[PDB]
Design an enzyme around this catalytic site. Structure first.
Site, PDB file in Angstrom:
ATOM      1  N   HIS A  84      25.906  81.976 -60.904  1.00  0.00           N
ATOM      2  CA  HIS A  84      24.504  82.340 -60.774  1.00  0.00           C
ATOM      3  C   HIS A  84      24.108  83.462 -61.717  1.00  0.00           C
ATOM      4  O   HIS A  84      22.937  83.862 -61.715  1.00  0.00           O
ATOM      5  CB  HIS A  84      24.162  82.673 -59.307  1.00  0.00           C
ATOM      6  CG  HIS A  84      24.840  83.890 -58.750  1.00  0.00           C
ATOM      7  ND1 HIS A  84      24.728  85.140 -59.319  1.00  0.00           N
ATOM      8  CD2 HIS A  84      25.592  84.052 -57.636  1.00  0.00           C
ATOM      9  CE1 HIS A  84      25.399  86.016 -58.591  1.00  0.00           C
ATOM     10  NE2 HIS A  84      25.928  85.381 -57.560  1.00  0.00           N
ATOM     11  N   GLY A  88      24.287  93.679 -57.540  1.00  0.00           N
ATOM     12  CA  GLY A  88      25.144  93.874 -58.686  1.00  0.00           C
ATOM     13  C   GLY A  88      26.632  93.857 -58.389  1.00  0.00           C
ATOM     14  O   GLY A  88      27.429  93.824 -59.336  1.00  0.00           O
ATOM     15  N   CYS A 145      28.184  91.426 -57.130  1.00  0.00           N
ATOM     16  CA  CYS A 145      28.516  90.076 -57.575  1.00  0.00           C
ATOM     17  C   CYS A 145      29.657  90.072 -58.587  1.00  0.00           C
ATOM     18  O   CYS A 145      29.609  90.807 -59.575  1.00  0.00           O
ATOM     19  CB  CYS A 145      27.239  89.439 -58.139  1.00  0.00           C
ATOM     20  SG  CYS A 145      26.179  88.917 -56.782  1.00  0.00           S
TER      21      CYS A 145
END
Ligand code: JWI
Ligand code: JWI
Lengths: 305, 305
Positions: B41, B143, B145
């Site tokens: 993503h 963030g 991620c």
């Protein structure tokens, strides 16, 4: 979101841990620049431990009696001295992995990360606090001696603790990196009892702010109080007394949540006087006191290093 | 003595974390050998998130659209592909810090350490478990991620988790390093609810053994029970059902404490049916379920890496 017992990344301290053996005894040392730091009781024997005279024991010790290994390599010890309760072993090679660093003596209530080591190698990392009785509630087995506690501000490791010993009550005592113990403990095998383990009030309050930030709000009550009135209830529950500096330090969290510190105190007082009714806060059923107001900020803001 | 939420040392994973930016979006990647791993993503926009078609979105993307930084240096991306829900970005330089490593897909109830990162830099390390609803209860902000979860057996890092997203309930979802999500979650901004968060019974039992080892014995009761009879009480309290494999796995702890597993089950049943009466166990007022029977062993034996 979420809120965990978070330690600093351990990599920079990992590359500092060595193994120090002196005759029969093997524990961990800290290799920064051309000095290895370790607990002075490395020189003690089975017979010395009730009553050791470290100066007399050091007469019988020379540079070559200290075996310092970093992985599979030995380091050459070119000089040794005793500073308080630590030995400083000068070796002829600077640690190439030496980070930026400071030695700092922390206050009770402050937190730090521990890299628990055995035989100079790391086993795990975890977070803890200097308790107001100057113990820490660690996870240490025999041989963990010489493991260190530390904070990291960006690039700089400020070492604040070196682990020396376990007390019969299962808590842990130690020194700063200048070899001065925290609290009244001494590196002998003799009856040593901890004082009252009081709760770090400011840290509890900061953790309550972290819950609000994470959506756990059920304990927000409809009251406020005063510093003097809160401390009356706090001393009854063996909470550390709250000061105006504690209030000021909680200011950033006050501002971010819209909840005045003294309102948060009234909520804490209600939780102390009435209990938690089997509810949880941030997954705990105890008022957690080992997160500082810088800890919550960092974790709830993402400060990196 | 003592017993802490202990994570593995993070150094070997620290030297693997990079920053991946694709157009507007910046998250963390994992640099092992000449491949950078990150959540797919990264290619999504503000507009794509409810319903993204990742193949269509990848048509508009070339090697040079992925900016990969390691500290202050850029890495040259020579090839990219999508494997399930992760991107594999081939770069023209092997990571010199690449450790020995494996990719493993863990089972619910197993634990691992998370190195939480922002912009490719580490902020902290902490321990957590794959819950039986295939969420994890993390500490992650925007963030984070691309942060990874991992175990270390001696020299070998077995990466088991990559962080992808937060659910509206504040828990966290993610994939193994082959990009297959744990549980039913998908990398879209759409209504996704966690199933029942049941308690990992075997992990609770292992933690009770760790308490006995540390001297906290007040809960040792005078009963025993059977697997079938314990599970009747366990299912009522949303505990995972206990199997014979769970018993066998607890065998080493059984042997070290002299306490049969099924006796420990009767003690747990008494704690479940009667509560903890405001007492604590190992400093907790909750039955802790995020320590495995290998976790206690390691911490209560000092296994190094
Ligand atoms: C140090 C490495 O061997 C160590 O683990 N350790 C220890 C032993 C002896 C000392 C003296 C100062 C007495 C020489 C200091 C530390 C043990 C430990 O602390 N045992 C104490 C000895 C006196 C009574 C209570 C237990 C240790 C064990 C677990 C965790 N930390 C330290
Ligand atoms: C990833 C880095 O930006 C990130 O932090 N994050 C996230 C945003 C968007 C996605 C999509 C798959 C929808 C593109 C995935 C991850 C957020 C996050 O998960 N927000 C979700 C979005 C949908 C509703 C619930 C919140 C994030 C924030 C904190 C911790 N982890 C992830």
């Amino acid at each position: 979101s979420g809120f965990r017992k978070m330690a600093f990344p351990s990599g920079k301290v990992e590359g500092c841990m060595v193994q120090v053996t002196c005759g029969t005894t093997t524990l961990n040392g800290l290799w920064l620049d051309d000095v290895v730091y370790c607990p002075r009781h490395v020189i003690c024997t089975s017979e010395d431990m009730l009553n050791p005279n470290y100066e007399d024991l050091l007469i019988r010790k020379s540079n070559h009696n200290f075996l310092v290994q970093a992985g599979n390599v030995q380091l050459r010890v070119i000089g040794h001295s005793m500073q308080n309760c630590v030995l400083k072993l000068k070796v002829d090679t600077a640690n190439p992995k030496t980070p930026k660093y400071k030695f700092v003596r922390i206050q009770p209530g402050q937190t730090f990360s521990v890299l628990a080591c055995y035989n100079g190698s790391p086993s795990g990392v975890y977070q803890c606090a200097m308790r107001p009785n100057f113990t820490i509630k660690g996870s240490f087995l025999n041989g963990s001696c010489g493991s260190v506690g530390f904070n990291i501000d960006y690039d700089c490791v400020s070492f604040c603790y070196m682990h020396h010993m376990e007390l019969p009550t299962g808590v842990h005592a130690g020194t700063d990196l200048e070899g001065n113990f925290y609290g009244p403990f001494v590196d002998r095998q003799t009856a040593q009892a901890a004082g009252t383990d009081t709760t770090i009030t400011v840290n509890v309050l900061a953790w309550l702010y972290a819950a609000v930030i994470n959506g756990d709000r059920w304990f927000l009550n409809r009251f406020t109080t005063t510093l003097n009135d809160f401390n009356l209830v706090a001393m009854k529950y063996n909470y550390e007394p709250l000061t105006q500096d504690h209030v000021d330090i909680l200011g950033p969290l006050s501002a971010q949540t819209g909840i005045a510190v003294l309102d948060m105190c009234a909520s804490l007082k209600e939780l102390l006087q009435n209990g938690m009714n089997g509810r949880t806060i941030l997954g705990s059923a105890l008022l957690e006191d080992e997160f500082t107001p810088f800890d919550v900020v960092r974790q709830c803001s993402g400060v990196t290093f």
